[PDB]
Amino acid sequence: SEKYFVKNGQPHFLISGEVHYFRINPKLWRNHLQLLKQTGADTVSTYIPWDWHEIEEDDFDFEGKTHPARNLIRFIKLCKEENLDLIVKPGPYILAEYENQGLPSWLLKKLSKNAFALDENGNVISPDLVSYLSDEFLEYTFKWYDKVMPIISKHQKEHYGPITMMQLCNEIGVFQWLSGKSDYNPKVINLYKEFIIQRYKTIEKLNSVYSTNYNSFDDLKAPSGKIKLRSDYCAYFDFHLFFREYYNKYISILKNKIRSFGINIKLTHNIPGWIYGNASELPMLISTYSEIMKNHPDIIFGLDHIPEFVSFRNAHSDLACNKILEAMQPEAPVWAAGFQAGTREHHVKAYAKDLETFYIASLAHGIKGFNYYMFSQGINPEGKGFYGKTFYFQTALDAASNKLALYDSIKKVNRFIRKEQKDLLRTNVNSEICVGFYKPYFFTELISSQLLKEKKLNVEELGLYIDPRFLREEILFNGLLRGLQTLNYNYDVVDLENCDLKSLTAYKQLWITSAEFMDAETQNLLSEFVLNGGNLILYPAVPTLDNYLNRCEILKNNFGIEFITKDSSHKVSAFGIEDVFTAFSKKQIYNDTNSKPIAFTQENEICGIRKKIGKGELTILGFAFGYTSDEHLELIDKLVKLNKIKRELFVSDKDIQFVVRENNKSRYIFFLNYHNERKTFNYRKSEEISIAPFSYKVIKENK
Amino acid sequence: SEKYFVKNGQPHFLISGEVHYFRINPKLWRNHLQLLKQTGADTVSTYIPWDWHEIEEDDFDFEGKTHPARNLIRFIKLCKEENLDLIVKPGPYILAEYENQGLPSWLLKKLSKNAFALDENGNVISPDLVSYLSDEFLEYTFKWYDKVMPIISKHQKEHYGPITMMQLCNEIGVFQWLSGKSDYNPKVINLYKEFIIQRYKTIEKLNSVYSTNYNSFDDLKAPSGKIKLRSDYCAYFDFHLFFREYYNKYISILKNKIRSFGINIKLTHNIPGWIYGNASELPMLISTYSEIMKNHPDIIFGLDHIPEFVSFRNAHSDLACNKILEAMQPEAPVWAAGFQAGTREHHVKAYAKDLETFYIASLAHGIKGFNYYMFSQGINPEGKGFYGKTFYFQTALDAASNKLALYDSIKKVNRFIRKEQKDLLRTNVNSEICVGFYKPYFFTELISSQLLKEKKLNVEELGLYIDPRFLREEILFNGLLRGLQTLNYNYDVVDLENCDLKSLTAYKQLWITSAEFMDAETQNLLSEFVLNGGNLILYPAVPTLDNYLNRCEILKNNFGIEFITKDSSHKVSAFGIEDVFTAFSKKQIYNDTNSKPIAFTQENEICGIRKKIGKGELTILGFAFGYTSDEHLELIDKLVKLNKIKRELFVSDKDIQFVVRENNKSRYIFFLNYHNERKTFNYRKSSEEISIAPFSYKVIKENK
Ligand SMILES: OC[C@H]1NC[C@H](O)[C@@H](O)[C@@H]1O
Ligand SMILES: OC[C@H]1NC[C@H](O)[C@@H](O)[C@@H]1O
Ligand SMILES: [Ca+2]
Ligand SMILES: [Ca+2]
């Protein structure tokens, strides 16, 4: 049932350390590799920077002819000699605070204006930022691949060499995330038009969806600036779908070119999204890769986990991310390609004693492998560093291979993992709760994000009151998911797109955080789920619109729901819990025919009901609660207990988090103390223990 | 020397605890007051909520006639019986996680639209957000004061009651700030117009400053939407000056009303600005009080410190805020009207072990008094909680008066303070470094802030590149101030407005973080500072504009500086430090003339020089750095060492923070470990061994 890496036909915990050969004194390459191996790590990970090896146009150095740290061949030979597998990341983009993000200076100087990402006024966005499908950019990328890929091919695992995985580029679309700005290159806008024409066939079909009045596709302009009309919302929605297809076209081009050298190893890509030690935006980045993930079984996405600290302030970020990736990529292990080791930023401390707790929490939260980023600090050679001489701080090893405090923490965690991995990797949590992932609420990197200062999406201007980013961040991520983890209730996430009914029927409850819009397919899926005997929890809105904000009331009509939207005090009562804070004065007030009222406004109007539909049960709440009070945890607890779901343990201290992972034979209880307080507690199944601040205890049980 | 509170002409550390009588069973009021007093607290603090006591329009209960917890009179008499002084805070706003921020439900339903703060389109920003000088709002506020102020007056200290201080309203502008919109109410528009006419006298004069072509004052309106022209920037700048006079007018109206009741006690106000456990926007909000603090010597402002956690992530916020309050209120003690105790919200934990370290760091950082907020948890009666039934968590006492973990932390801190307050309050740190506080860089709450929904200020549109908010947040607050604290160099902050030359000459170094604009008066003061023998460190720009972005080259000409602004790599070399990352491509490029070049671009162009001018020294860096790399701390350290400024102690672990506070008689060494690491280090005065737990402190007293 579990997905995990395999070595020597056994469950293998992938333990990789990022070591940038091009940022380390080559005299000390062997020493770094031996210290990495001595932690019990099995793999080493590195970029192969285009700029570093194509030193001038068509002048390649992979042998240290011009600088000993250009000796990639020797670095590969050292990995083999020190029995480390190798992950290679040849770009073309590598990011990683390398000048020009790893693209050669000589390339950027000589490319035409046409090869750059362009703003809506035809201006160069950044002297760094190419257009991914620029003819010129891809021609030079191919010429780089023509030299680096035969080296990778020779040393790939399917030729019994050390190279087990290769990353394609780095964080495709990251610059559209960081800026909130799309590439308006005429070549991209032409691919957008083909996408639109392909999707709608005729201008009449598009007009009826968008409510536009184009005489042809020639009158259709790429969306830009603020959404003022529903037609603008429609155009931006399809512009977001277009970019997911665009990224799939870019990564497919690179992949086919890589496969042409007989490279048959696993390909990777990695997902950023952590901001100031929380990851509530990372699901938006996962959503940018939806079309790659449906079209490429053979590309494994991993997570760049950057918690910065380990406390109740971010305890919930890593589980939610792991759970959502698992929903989007169920056939591949969940693994952290960028697993924080040290800090990218000197002024943002990474404490060994924090990260050690995060490493063990990551095991409780289902991680199957990771790549310590950065295991080894780096020194940028000769003006190659974007931001300073030094690359990362408080790592396992400094750039000179000095052991730092994190080294002993990684050795301790790695020893536990190696000891347990055969049982641990085959354990799962028993989840009787499923939480829906509705991808369209996440498709807003160009109009609404924590990185966009100026919002282009203001739902009030469209006659709506539930913002999909507020819903997915405060009601879902920081709300329900945070609530369930705090209450020590196991949950799974499911991708609602082309979701199989049978895969929902395993759960005692499905929870859906709904805005006022939801496509017919999902409305239909949830209708069938309940009618066939599923228990559905839905809030804060029964949807009445589809993704284009055209009328779609399938779920409402199938469930016999009638409501009016009315203003009331922010607080409601729900299941006899008084003073439940809700986010909106506007609430759905339900007709209660054939329904049990279970929630009331201050004026005693009915803003939540329970009813039987077919063989199933429906709980709808016409109001938005996250987790900003103890009443919110009481409400989540009452809802879970409607279907008599139980925690795996009774723990005396409610502020101790636990995860029970088991298979037929083995049980692991992970206790996690996210608080600055020594806690003593006892536990028993549904026996006294002390945990230091910001710390952990793992207890094993043979069943 | 030091500002501190006194009682019987002795240094007294003000120790208050916040106890909301309205949120506690009145049968337990005495038990809360006794337990507060047993910690060594001398004072109890509370809101008197308008909504709680005017139960319906013109129906008042201060005696517990309709609800026992409405017996304000009995609470006042218990404070007297239990020998606590009382701070009262009757609003009209209290915030306090109370429904409608403490304003009565019946008021907000009764008020016409023009009582409310309105956006640019004339719509109500928020149903509990009033326009402060609304005739209707002040009418009902006055009727509330008519009933509560006679009780307060009767129970003052001078009439043998316990009431020693009263807060006027609550964090003026906080509600407007949190809404992310500014107030365009027609009262604001009309008062702005009168302000502009008073300021310019003739349309010709305003046109000469703004570069506009108005025919009359009737053509001009309060600026709205985004700044596109320098004339728009000018209009917003005067709009910021106007809002400072407007907040002065609000608190003047409340103050004159209160005085009319024979209330002679000390009046207070409280400063907002912490959010998510940092305070980089607090200086902006304190700047909105500039006209109050110039006009009201007798109103003592205190800080509302909400750290939430205590780590290197926020170590610098409390010190910078204390220093900035001192710069703006130099004749009163620095004190915390709100001194975090527990958490206002369940999902944001407050640990006794964090907060105990914060209390000790606050002593190190020069705090002279505080009010633990909340000392006592409360339960909201009658659905009065904004966010839920329970008011605060992880406090010193639960609502029932049980001691929680924090109680023992507060007892330990207060015992230290009462044992030492006679010396400690008279101690100073030895600051050889002064940092300039240039208030106009902070005047952006209408156009640019972390909370403001619209970005109205893009300096690039005005042909500028140094954004004043980026400068004050990243180069000053999170940059220089953070760097100096991390490096264990003492600094003072001085308000440059009307600043006395005499008060700058005490320092070895004056540091100015400058944008491209600075008024003639400040340009002249820094000129005279250096000519008379001051040592000036100025970056990232020689300013050449005044506050209206018109030409002002006083400083540039007085310092004999020639520069061109050019693009280069972000990276510079400075003082032999390579790969110093700077925030802007554009840098100032200086001539060689009569100067030592000490910083260079990737093209080896001169972007920093040192020179002797008159009796003084000038270091100018034509580039912006905060603290986002190890190179930045190395650069700050190099600049401090230019004038041989030394740390008080050699400490073997650079990540240990210390403060040495001393007077003639006593030395206190504070060690602060802001890191999740047990640290064993040695130290000596410029060797003793110390082990310090994570997120912990040591205090050593020496008799000299
Ligand atoms: O938000 C916490 C606390 N900050 C300070 C405010 O004045 C007070 O009303 C509030 O309860
Ligand atoms: O956290 C934001 C804001 N909340 C309200 C508090 O009273 C204020 O002091 C604080 O700055
Ligand atoms: Ca799982
Ligand atoms: Ca019905």
Author numbering:
A (entry chain B): 6 to 691, 700 to 716
B (entry chain A): 6 to 691, 699 to 716
What did the original publication write about this model?
The IALB_1185 protein, which is encoded in the gene cluster for endo-β-1,2-glucanase homologs in the genome of Ignavibacterium album, is a glycoside hydrolase family (GH) 35 protein. Here, we showed using recombinant IALB_1185 that this protein has glycosyltransferase activity toward β-1,2-glucooligosaccharides, and that the kinetic parameters for β-1,2-glucooligosaccharides are not within the ranges for general GH enzymes. We propose that IALB_1185 be redefined β-1,2-glucooligosaccharide:d-glucoside β-d-glucosyltransferase as a systematic name and β-1,2-glucosyltransferase as an accepted name.
In order to understand the binding modes of ligands, the complex structures of WT with glucose (Glc) and Sop2 and the complex of the E343G mutant with 1-deoxynojirimycin (DNJ) were determined. c The E343G mutant was used for the complex with DNJ. The electron densities of DNJ molecules were observed only in subunit A in the E343G mutant. The DNJ molecules are located at subsites −1 and +1 like Sop2 in the WT-Sop2 complex. The DNJ molecule at subsite +1 is well superimposed with the corresponding moiety in the WT-Sop2 complex. This is probably due to pushing up of the anomeric area by the Glu343 side chain, because the potential distance between the side chain oxygen atom in the carboxy group of Glu343 and the carbon atom corresponding to an anomeric one in the DNJ molecule is too close (1.3 Å). The potentially too close distance between the DNJ molecule at subsite −1 and the Glu343 side chain suggests that an α-anomeric configuration of a Glc molecule is not allowed at subsite −1.
